[PDB]
């Protein structure tokens, strides 16, 4: 739950990610990658990548960088009002690509990480507070419908 002033942040922040998508949706998942190489392994497109290199010079690592954003960046945009466009991913996630919720705890700290790279200096306190906010809402639906679905 998140004041109209919290969400006001979550959305003023989210205007540094339009402006450059596919860069910011590039760093996003070759920060998750790296971090958590147990991550990869859940990407059939992607476990080819063994370096940070082949990773960055991958132009459909990118685009799906742009697919996930394009995706959050539409549920951000509900303001918690998202069940209808948070279903779909929910049970795609769970049933299709069997994604543990800690691994949604994992990009979303890396999506805290890539702003501060971003934009040092100017992703302040109240910013990453309300950003948090957001995504711990995100990942705690996703997590209602994991325990709906018995998924672990
Ligand atoms: C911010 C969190 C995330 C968002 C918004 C997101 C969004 C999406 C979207 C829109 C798709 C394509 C449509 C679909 O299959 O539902 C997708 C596919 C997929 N997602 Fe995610 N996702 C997120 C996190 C993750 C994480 C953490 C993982 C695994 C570590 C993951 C694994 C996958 C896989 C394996 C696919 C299928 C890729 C393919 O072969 O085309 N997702 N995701």
């Not at 790296?34 to 370096?51: A, N, Q, S, V």
């Not at 996930?68 to 929910?90: D, Q, R, S, Y």
């Amino acid at each position: 739950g998140l004041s109209d002033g919290e969400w006001q942040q979550v959305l003023n922040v989210w205007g540094k990610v339009e402006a450059d998508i596919a860069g910011h949706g590039q760093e996003v998942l070759i920060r998750l990658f790296t971090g958590h190489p147990e991550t990869l392994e859940k990407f059939d497109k992607f476990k080819h990548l063994k370096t940070e290199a082949e990773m960055k010079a991958s132009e459909d690592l990118k685009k799906h960088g742009t697919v996930v954003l394009t995706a959050l960046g539409g549920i951000l945009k509900k303001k918690g009002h998202h069940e209808a466009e948070l279903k779909p991913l929910a049970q795609s996630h769970a049933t299709k690509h069997k994604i543990p919720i800690k691994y949604l705890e994992f990009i979303s700290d890396a999506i805290i990480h890539v702003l501060h790279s971003k934009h040092p200096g100017d992703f302040g306190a109240d910013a990453q507070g309300a950003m948090t906010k957001a995504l711990e809402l995100f990942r705690n639906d996703i997590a209602a419908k994991y325990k709906e679905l018995g998924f672990q």
